[PDB]
Write a protein that binds this ligand. Sequence first.
Ligand SMILES: [Mg+2]
Ligand SMILES: [Mg+2]
Ligand SMILES: [Mg+2]
Ligand SMILES: [Mg+2]
Ligand SMILES: [Mg+2]
Lengths: 169, 169, 171, 170, 171, 175, 171, 171, 169, 170
Amino acid sequence: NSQLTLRALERGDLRFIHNLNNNRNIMSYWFEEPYESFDELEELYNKHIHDNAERRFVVEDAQKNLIGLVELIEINYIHRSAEFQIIIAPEHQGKGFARTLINRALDYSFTILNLHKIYLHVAVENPKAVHLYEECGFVEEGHLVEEFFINGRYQDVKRMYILQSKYLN
Amino acid sequence: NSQLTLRALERGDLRFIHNLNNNRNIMSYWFEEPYESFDELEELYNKHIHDNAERRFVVEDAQKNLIGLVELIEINYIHRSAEFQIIIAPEHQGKGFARTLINRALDYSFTILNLHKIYLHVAVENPKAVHLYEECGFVEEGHLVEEFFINGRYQDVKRMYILQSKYLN
Amino acid sequence: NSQLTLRALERGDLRFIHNLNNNRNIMSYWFEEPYESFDELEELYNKHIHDNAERRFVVEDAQKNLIGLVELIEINYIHRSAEFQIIIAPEHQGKGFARTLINRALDYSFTILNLHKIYLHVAVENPKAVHLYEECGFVEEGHLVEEFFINGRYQDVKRMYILQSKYLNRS
Amino acid sequence: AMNSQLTLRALERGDLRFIHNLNNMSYWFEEPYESFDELEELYNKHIHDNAERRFVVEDAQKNLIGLVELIEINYIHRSAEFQIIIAPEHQGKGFARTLINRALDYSFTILNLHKIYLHVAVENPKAVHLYEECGFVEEGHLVEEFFINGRYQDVKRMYILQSKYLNRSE
Amino acid sequence: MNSQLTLRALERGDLRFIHNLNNNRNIMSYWFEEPYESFDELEELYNKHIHDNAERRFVVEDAQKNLIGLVELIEINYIHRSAEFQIIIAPEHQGKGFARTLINRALDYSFTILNLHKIYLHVAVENPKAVHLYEECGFVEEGHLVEEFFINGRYQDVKRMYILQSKYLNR
Amino acid sequence: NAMNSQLTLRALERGDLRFIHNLNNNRNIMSYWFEEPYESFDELEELYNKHIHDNAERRFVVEDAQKNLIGLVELIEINYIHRSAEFQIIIAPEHQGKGFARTLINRALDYSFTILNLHKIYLHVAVENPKAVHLYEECGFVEEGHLVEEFFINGRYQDVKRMYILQSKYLNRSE
Amino acid sequence: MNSQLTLRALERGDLRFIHNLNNNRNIMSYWFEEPYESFDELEELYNKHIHDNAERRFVVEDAQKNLIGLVELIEINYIHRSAEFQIIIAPEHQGKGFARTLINRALDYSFTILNLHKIYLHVAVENPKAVHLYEECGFVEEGHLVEEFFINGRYQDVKRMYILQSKYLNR
Amino acid sequence: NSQLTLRALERGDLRFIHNLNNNRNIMSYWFEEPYESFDELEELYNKHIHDNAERRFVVEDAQKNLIGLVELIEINYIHRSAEFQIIIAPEHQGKGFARTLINRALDYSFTILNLHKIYLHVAVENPKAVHLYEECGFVEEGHLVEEFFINGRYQDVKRMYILQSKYLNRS
Amino acid sequence: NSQLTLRALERGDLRFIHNLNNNRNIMSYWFEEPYESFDELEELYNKHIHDNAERRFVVEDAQKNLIGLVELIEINYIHRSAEFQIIIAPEHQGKGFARTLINRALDYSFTILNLHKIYLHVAVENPKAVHLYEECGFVEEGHLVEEFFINGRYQDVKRMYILQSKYLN
Amino acid sequence: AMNSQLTLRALERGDLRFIHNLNNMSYWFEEPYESFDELEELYNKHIHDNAERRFVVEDAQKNLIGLVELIEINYIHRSAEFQIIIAPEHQGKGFARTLINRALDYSFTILNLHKIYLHVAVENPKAVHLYEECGFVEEGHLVEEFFINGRYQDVKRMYILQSKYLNRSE
Ligand SMILES: [Mg+2]
Ligand SMILES: [Mg+2]
Ligand SMILES: [Mg+2]
Ligand SMILES: [Mg+2]
Ligand SMILES: [Mg+2]
């Protein structure tokens, strides 16, 4: 589990991005523009390559297998906040990486990027995930009502946060 | 049937959709622009690559044979409607695939794009397709008189619809 | 009514078009692109100036007051059909002008542009408009269920049509 | 009386000066800017972009009263964030309520959105009250969210849904 | 009075005259084989084709500078040395005897300056007097084009009529 | 007859331009692309890029089942108000006198009248080619004009027949 | 062997042949009346004048595709129906009898396809045998231009010689 | 010497030009614009490709080795004069090539470009170069006092010239 | 003489310098580009407005009459040299102004641009101007043979110079 | 030996990566930048601008050793500011002296400048020594001039004149 690195995303990784944001039955976005096809995604990559409102990090193991993806979006450089999201590739889900990847993401965000606050959205219908992020130090600050249409109905999500000052004690 | 997949159209697919027009004595359109040559198609494709008014999925089996095409056009995000069509390659017709593909398209339209109405047009002189869409839950809402010039004369078409609220319950 | 003229829209008429949107309370489109501001419209106008999929005619009286707009949209030159809409400025409604403008539009469509079919959508909750189009030769070919979100809810519309051969042979 | 003569019209290029003066950090389609030149460039870039929509507010003599914004507009989830700014010289006149309701009319009867939400500083319970009286309910108390006046402050997230707004009096 | 009529090459400033002329005949107008309705469309086509030598147009004026009409040559092919000719006279000046003079000026330009070999035109079969005017100017019928144009509500036949350089020059 | 039925028509593409160019090889006439003249391949290529979306002319390359290049069907001066167009067919010299012309004329008419929904097709044919005049009469075309010294061809001015057929005559024969 | 020579219209790929040909005659070369020395200059002029019909050029090849020479028409005026002609034969192929054939192909194009009326050329007075070759091809002297060109160190006289369409077509 | 050819400079030769600057230790100019980097030069090249105020010729042997450069600058077509410079790559100096290149440049200037006067500047502290140009027909017309800052100090240069009439009448 | 001023050329001055070319049977140049029409001059002016290779001053008296033109061209900032010329309008010739204007130009060249050498060209057949520039401290450094075609034949000119070190002491 | 194989050549577009890596705040013709994209845009803008001039330094095997800069070049007053940067991996090898003298050769024998000056952190007296041994003399002790390492530091301004450099050994 200590074998896991975050690498900044490069053009070559878009194939992985696409494979991941695939069998997920939700709309996938790149800098808030939606895409389904690889070619749509590439054209978006080229259009937003200099924009730093979102920052993505590919996660690899010791033999550089692609394990998953860390995204930060809605980055705001005045308030120093960002929305966190994680995708583990289906083949590596359930092996114990989620916790490790999360703490690596927090470490990157809070030391290297010097962000003040990280948040995320977790479906309320997934109380397992909620409890996971809880165990990793996140706390509820919001119960967003019918925020997202997911799987043919409107759903609530927990808004959960952690501050730099708490993670660094 | 259960092994049929939908995949968003890429540039590599244009040859396939172009060949699918051979077996159709009719004019084809890309984002409401007519075309005949592949080169015209490729230019239209580049031009409308992020245009969200239309969406197309290539159908394949598990062997990656190219089975057909699912199209949603005239997507309107205010009225939350879209027109649906399907083309199945000649060799794969009368294999009972149509029903499955129709349902995949409704599924996409209603569970992920969060649309409210899906309509289509069926030649009145194809009461077999008429009946199939009835079986899928579409109902007639119009009988358009001399709407389209097809095979050397003006022909009526049914306009058939189904609503998000019926498909999801 | 005889002093009502049709004239191809121009750039100078855009301010009139924009003001016709004021009390209509729906989304306005230019060649299927949505807009609200005058600056948006002016720019869509310049982009689509050679695009033949829509055509528009300002309606003026003998004194060049701006009376209304005739629009043809979704024009298709294979099937030879188009969708028709008419808008009369509120200060000119209830003066019987609509019938004349409907006929001028049909005349242009069927005697100059050489289309085969004209069709339109009318709110089911506006039976006067429906009856008006009926008197002008239109016939219901559909009752479209919850087709448009209009003013807080989905409404049904009649789709009504007339053919070139019926208009041209009329008494 | 005065409220009923307030009008909304879509923001034009000529209104960008008014906008600039309203900030005496700013954003335009989530792009950051400071100088009037910067804003005007961003405006030309996003003129047909439908993710945000602004209305400038005027009285009968055509004075500039303030601004209604819808941002973060998403047409899948059918939601948007609402902000209102009233010029200093026209505050404490009752306008806010009138404008909030126009923005909701637009959002729910023309855009056909499902959910409108806003953020309001917790250290401004008068605004909070106002939004509650308009039908907004708290769904979040966001901890140390926005750097405001040399320090981080909590903000309320409040929302209202299409069907609640439209059927209110039924 | 007829020797007092002048041709001068069309300028930008004459576009509004051209547009009114054509507006009022209820036909679809074309500029360098591209279609237009909107003045702004005419003006852009004008800027695009300004040095293009496939069409040439002359505005006709009297000595008082009243705008009389228009002489057009189109489809000008410099290999086959042919062009299509048309004349349009403003309605207020029709019937005054100007047409023969204008037809001859057009021929004189075509045959003594551009050095063309053949000039031709189309004339509605339903206008036999114009047929006769052109015959009396030297044109002969070489075709009866069946349902060639859709004009004011129906498909019309037109006569195609021509004259050769050698014939016009040896009168 | 066997080979006639196996001919296909397909929309002209960029890679077909060499073929179009070679087709002018022993034609001794000025060739045009959307009414602009040209002579070299490189000239033609640039004209093709320029009018790729232009709907006033349409061209179909003709091939057999082994994808030999048989010839070209060309519709020009397409007008969608009057609903008319001018038609030409060119068969490569090696594939002439195998009966293909009749078949390709019928395909062009079929496309024009059942897909484009045009009302009239016409063509021009050299008065000095009475054999083609007769072929077009057999396909339903009728003389509507005898155009005097219309074109300069091979060193002198020549007359042409203008011949037409109407959609209603082609589609209603067997109705 | 002479009937086995072909003309085909100049392509981009033939620019290097043209440039070597002209390099080696020690004269100042022009492309569409604009001067060049540098190949890169030739290539840009090529791109700029690619559809311009005032000059036309044909590369001459044998059956084995050896590059033989060049036939040029310039100053092509479509009102007066005249052009200036030149032929350049690569030095290795001079003396082989190709010239008469090339001159005739050039005339055939000029007079049977472009429908020109007059073709002319300039020929150094100090090359009386070429004068004679052109006479024997039908050209007649119509001018002796005095010190017209500065060529290889001095001002040279040239003969101007022409032939008419009517004469070439009735041989 | 006879196998030395002059050829109009091209884009591909720019790397050679840049390397000729390496051990010269002076400012280099392209059409009077100063440069040091290859990227600067490449861009000045594209800008001035149609500019006739300077002209340059790469010198190649029979084996296409790059031997040197002939430049004409400050060319004026009224007065018919230009300034001349010659540069031989260091690995080709001391082989007697300079005289041949000087003559090739004069030949081009006076027999093709038709100039009247060629002039050049030679460091007074290089009397061999001076004597060389003298043998080629140049004559001192000035001794320019502290004209150029060269290698740490102002130096004098001879201005030397030859006229077209003297070069062309020479033995 | 002491009341003559130098003023940098503006757009408003182009008519003046254009009229000054009438009284000169010679071709004029603007940044080494030839021209004849005013419109050509105006385009050249716009194009070279910040080009520092040439500098021009209009001479006026205290009444603001337009007396003449002082030009410095071929300004080189490495070799620190420039060519000087002067034109005095016909009506103002033989008023003893020339000497004064020459000195103003040297003054500018040597005290403000910090140039090292100033040269000029004088027709050999104008020994009167030759002598004047000698009196101002210019010395002959060349006798350029048939340098310029003037009034229908090639003519010699002297090239005369003066150095910063002589003018300032 | 190693010093004599150092070469200078004018900066090209291909060298901008090397430049970027040398900063692990930066300026380009006095315009500020951070990302590699930013620099490349500034480079295209100032490619023919003569107010600054850069030379990249290479050995015989063509490794990138460092950079010589002349900036603030003024051709009236005939002066410029000099900076030298040597890559970390090649420091403490004696190169600096060799490069300083090449830069002065260029400035005084080809540009014909009168004065070259530099700024050097007062808290780096080794550099100061080096520049003095090269003929530079202090003309200023600039108080709290440059923010460096979270605080303001003094810097020496040092200069040398053309005639002093060129006649040194005479
Ligand atoms: Mg956002
Ligand atoms: Mg549509
Ligand atoms: Mg035509
Ligand atoms: Mg000429
Ligand atoms: Mg110069």
